[PDB]
Nucleic acid binder design. Sequence first.
RNA 1: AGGGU
Length: 106
Amino acid sequence: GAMAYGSRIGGGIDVPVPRHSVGVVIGRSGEMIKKIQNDAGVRIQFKQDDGTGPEKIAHIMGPPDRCEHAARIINDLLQSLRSGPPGPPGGPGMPPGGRGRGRGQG
RNA sequence: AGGGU
């Protein structure tokens, strides 16, 4: 939605986390989001699925300032995914594999 | 780094 007045925070904010980074920010064992909840002192609970965007909405509840703090931890964790871990192939570098050569020997 | 409660 065109929320031109979305500059106002509150006691619990809805943060848009990329759907390809949902498990990332929480961690495979949830150890990661516990750190976010720890360093911010907030209750971060992923909602079912608002579906109103290419992201997932997570309701970071708690004291507004801490919600901002918590939001930053998740957002920065996304920002660090942006060419953070360098990958030669797969991304900006197509592996020059042959036409089935290597596996297609017959 | 896919599910933490």
